[PDB]
Design an enzyme around this catalytic site. Structure first.
Site, short mmCIF file in Angstrom:
data_model
loop_
_atom_site.label_atom_id
_atom_site.label_comp_id
_atom_site.label_asym_id
_atom_site.label_seq_id
_atom_site.Cartn_x
_atom_site.Cartn_y
_atom_site.Cartn_z
N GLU A 12 13.33 26.62 -3.63
CA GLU A 12 12.95 25.24 -3.85
C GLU A 12 12.76 24.71 -2.46
O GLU A 12 13.71 24.60 -1.70
CB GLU A 12 14.11 24.53 -4.55
CG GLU A 12 13.82 23.17 -5.19
CD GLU A 12 15.06 22.60 -5.89
OE1 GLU A 12 16.09 22.38 -5.21
OE2 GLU A 12 15.01 22.37 -7.12
N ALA A 14 11.20 21.78 0.19
CA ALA A 14 11.17 20.32 0.15
C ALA A 14 10.05 19.86 -0.78
O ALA A 14 10.28 19.24 -1.81
CB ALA A 14 10.94 19.78 1.56
N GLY A 16 8.57 21.17 -3.01
CA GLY A 16 8.69 21.56 -4.40
C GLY A 16 9.34 22.91 -4.60
O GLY A 16 10.26 23.30 -3.88
N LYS A 34 3.48 28.00 -4.55
CA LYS A 34 4.25 26.84 -4.12
C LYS A 34 3.56 25.66 -4.83
O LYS A 34 2.44 25.27 -4.49
CB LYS A 34 4.25 26.69 -2.59
CG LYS A 34 5.37 27.50 -1.89
CD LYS A 34 5.19 27.62 -0.37
CE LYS A 34 5.05 26.25 0.30
NZ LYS A 34 4.81 26.26 1.79
N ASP A 113 12.74 26.39 9.88
CA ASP A 113 13.63 27.24 9.10
C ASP A 113 13.12 28.66 9.25
O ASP A 113 12.70 29.27 8.27
CB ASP A 113 13.55 26.79 7.62
CG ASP A 113 14.58 27.47 6.72
OD1 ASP A 113 15.59 28.01 7.22
OD2 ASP A 113 14.37 27.45 5.49
#
EC number: 2.7.11.22
Lengths: 269, 125, 269, 125
Positions: A12, A14, A16, A34, A113
């Site tokens: 999940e 940000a 979606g 996505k 990330d």
């Protein structure tokens, strides 16, 4: 509408959710979807398609469809025969990761990330950057199971919380780089603080300059203690590697090496 | 109620440990994943440790993918992970099955240029 | 700079972190700080101050300082003597929660994460809305420990993912409302899907209309099954309550009751 | 290394269960929280179950708050949670201690208008 069939949820982000799916137009091949709502480079996971789900009175369900390499650098490193990952290959993978991460900076993009679980290693050991938001939240030392959402590749910057610049990724590439040789993370933090310390324990407390004034945890709280030698935890790492490693794993973002330049470093000789 | 959905994303995310845990925490190694597709169908081929984990844990290696009809050994073959293929193989999945487009994992592997898998399959069959 | 001393981390909201702190200017009293970075109503947790940490070349560390009530409706409900929370009080608390939640809508504000752990119940049972982002991530039925980040108060809308409108909160108020009598959540989902089902199991599968076309999980997947009576899980709930409850706990956001109007409902007679 | 920081936010977040777990999972019921302040100092007064949990679990109820100098029984008194106060009380914390501004929990409770606590303290002292 989507031809790609959602085979499973895989994270999940940000924006979606992201699932695994089989692109039915091609071999039923695997593809990362996505699903978004609103209002190329060889080393980057390609965007096979942008499926528009619903145009409305401000809001638009889409479904980006990204390429998929079914194996992360994590299972990659997990997999290799006991001596470890071969040296030639690291320089390459490592090299690829950089060229790729560079390609993103070149266009305003900051990954933030960039954990190994986002780096994909193909059948042919061809690397591709990607993000899943999945969050492989961890538990500590066998009988010391402390939870955490694996923030081990987090830069000191983002840790202390005072930015999220282009060089944030580069610190990660370093963590990952150390980890290549490693097959064991360089810094396994539990809390955002633990991690902030750990890094220093290895790298060492920088002088009150690289480390800001305002930012969350004050420099002095992590008392100067240490200046541990890289070799102690990244064994069998040749000179230029030990070099480029520290050049990426440096506290001050602006001072820390760039992607672009990292490609040029001696190491990849 | 599912629970064995957590297991799918696990296998899918190639979460050896969670897959194990999930399993050795009472999780069904054969359930449809709310998206109808059991793990080891949705696992991260290439996460041999995971295929191996589920397989040798009550995991029917033979499963046609609802729409696609593709099978694990196929996928393993198309992504080049001999690792998962072989584990899948020794486990039971037959390395000469066809998908909706009528394809042997072999054909897939041969097609994408996966010499290795091409070998492990252009033999032992 | 902050006079309020960070006494402890208490959550990481999107915008940043939130700790407990003692406002040293007043009694060393407890106060919620939300440290942000950039580039009144009785039932709402007041904003004691906005401390500017650092004005820069685009980016500004701030430190909002919100009032603090040291006890959530969760410990509130957890605490009460065995028969349960008194009935008079619910109507009041319940009433307060609404008036408050209403006050937010009135100014474009959509809370979205309105869990009990965000509702504060004062010493005097005076309610205040607030958000901590903390995430009290859960584990299931004793011997069936399934993890989850407590999304039990999530609206079907946000679940299926097709919006995050003003009425999203109102569904939550309903979950919370049922829970008041309850002292046990109405719908304990593990996954985003589990929860989506559970709600229906209680409420019942709406006709293919209230439930959209595009949105994630298709109506038909949660086969019509059920139309369970409210009374079965919200016992001793008087008529007008049973009423306003369903009026808040209704599938179609636009159809679901509003905050404003909810205040007016018979119940609070 | 901390771990007993997780415990602070626990107590602080009034996470009875995590506090317990955290504790009965080998967590120090007396450690400074990286912010220097042990739980039961940072706990959610009003989460009697939590105060009670830590207290009757190796939890020194007497602690001056670094800067503030305030003590739990104080806070319990200022937020009106007789619950936590009493549990804190029976546990050991002395209900007649002063803070930096020189105040008895009593004074706090009396001040904010917490009749109840005002009583439990304007007695038993």
């Amino acid at each position: 509408d989507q031809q790609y069939e959602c085979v499973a949820e895989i994270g999940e982000g940000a924006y979606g959710k992201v699932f695994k799916a089989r692109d039915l137009k091609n071999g039923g091949r695997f593809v990362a979807l996505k699903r978004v709502r609103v209002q190329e480079h060889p080393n980057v996971v390609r965007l096979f398609d942008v499926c528009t789900v619903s145009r409305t009175d401000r809001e638009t369900k889409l479904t980006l469809v990204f390429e998929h390499v079914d194996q992360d650098l994590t299972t990659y490193l997990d997999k290799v025969p006991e001596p470890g990952v071969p040296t030639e290959t690291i320089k390459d993978m490592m090299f690829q990761l950089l060229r790729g991460l560079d390609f993103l900076h070149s266009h305003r993009v900051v990954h933030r990330d960039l954990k190994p679980q986002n780096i994909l290693v193909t059948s042919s050991g061809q690397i591709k950057l990607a993000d899943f938001g999945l969050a492989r939240i961890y538990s500590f030392q066998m009988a010391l199971t402390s939870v955490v959402v694996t923030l081990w590749y987090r830069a000191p910057e983002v840790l202390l919380q005072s930015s999220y610049a282009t060089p944030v990724d580069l610190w990660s590439v370093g963590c990952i780089f150390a980890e290549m040789f490693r097959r064991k993370p360089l810094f396994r933090g539990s809390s955002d603080v633990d991690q902030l310390g750990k890094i220093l324990d290895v790298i060492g407390l920088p002088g009150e300059e690289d480390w800001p004034r305002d930012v969350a945890l004050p420099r002095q709280a992590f008392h100067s203690k240490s200046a541990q030698p890289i070799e102690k935890f990244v064994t069998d790492i040749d000179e230029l590697g030990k070099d480029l490693l520290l050049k990426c794993l440096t506290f001050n973002p602006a001072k820390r090496i760039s992607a672009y330049s990292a490609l040029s470093h001696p190491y990849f000789q | 109620e599912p629970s064995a959905d957590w297991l799918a994303t696990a296998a899918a995310r190639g979460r050896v440990e969670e897959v194990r845990a999930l399993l050795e925490a009472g999780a069904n190694p054969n359930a449809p994943n709310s998206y109808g597709r059991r793990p080891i169908q949705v696992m991260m081929m290439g996460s041999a440790r995971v295929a191996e984990l589920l397989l040798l844990h009550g995991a029917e290696p033979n499963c046609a993918d609802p729409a696609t009809l593709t099978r694990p050994v196929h996928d393993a073959a198309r992504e080049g992970f001999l690792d998962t293929l072989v584990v899948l193989h020794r486990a039971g999945a037959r390395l000469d099955v066809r998908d909706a487009w009528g394809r042997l994992p072999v054909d897939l592997a041969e097609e994408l240029g996966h010499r290795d898998v091409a070998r492990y399959l252009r033999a032992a069959a």
